[PDB]
């Protein structure tokens, strides 16, 4: 993990990417689709997490803690990423694309924040190689302050991010400036997750997996 080069780190992350799933309206149906979608995504997220370099090194207790703390963040940054090339709309699934107006069914505060993040990713022209890095950072960082190895892996991903920026012809100033800009967005993603989670516990037929994620919070 720490032995991996930056090019190899990216290749591992890109190859561990979960697929874009499909879904099978009112405030009851809409939450139904998203819940069904999120629960199926979570199963792939677990397998993605296992393939994240340095993650299986942690205790099985810690692996659960990180995923329990970061699952909605990871779901959201994924959503934001897929909605990047669809301005003003959120692409939950290739067959499920919603506008802001169709967000007021149940949740409209969450929609605009995610849309803001998506347009922010686009304005920064976020690359996929950078995306998979941010996502792995979210996994390793969100629960690390709520428990030494992890901080070294985080440092590895930092080196990995800079490597991408350096290889894309950005000056050393733009490299650390872009690095800073990307990580500050993780503050907003954390915010959206917290706002989303209190809303999820408000309404909660959730599955076993998706319920166990919520009591963790």
């Amino acid at each position: 993990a720490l032995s991996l080069t930056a090019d190899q780190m990216v290749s591992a992350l890109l190859d561990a990417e979960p697929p874009i799933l499909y879904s099978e309206f009112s405030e009851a149906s809409m939450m139904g689709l998203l819940t069904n979608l999120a629960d199926r995504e979570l199963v792939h997220m677990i397998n993605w997490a296992k393939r994240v370099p340095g993650f299986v090194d942690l205790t099985l207790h810690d692996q659960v803690h990180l995923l329990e703390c970061a699952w909605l963040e990871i779901l959201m940054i994924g959503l934001v990423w897929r909605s990047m090339e669809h301005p003003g709309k959120l692409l939950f699934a290739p067959n499920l694309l919603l506008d802001r107006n169709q967000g007021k069914c149940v949740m409209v505060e969450i929609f605009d924040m995610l849309l803001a993040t998506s347009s922010r990713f686009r304005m920064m022209n976020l690359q996929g190689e950078e995306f998979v890095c941010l996502k792995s950072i979210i996994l390793l960082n969100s629960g690390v302050y709520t428990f030494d190895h992890i901080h070294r892996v985080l440092d590895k991903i930092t080196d990995t991010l800079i490597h991408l920026m350096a290889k894309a012809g950005l000056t050393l100033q733009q490299q650390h400036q872009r690095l800073a800009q990307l990580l500050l967005i993780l503050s907003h993603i954390r915010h959206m997750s917290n706002k989303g989670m209190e809303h999820l516990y408000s309404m909660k037929p959730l599955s076993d997996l998706l319920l166990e994620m919520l009591d963790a919070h």
Binding site: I46, L60, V64, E212
Partner: peptide, 10 residues
């Protein structure tokens, strides 16, 4: 126990 502890090692 927790569901998650099975998926993560299997």
């Amino acid at each position: 126990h927790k569901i998650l502890h099975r998926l993560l090692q299997d």
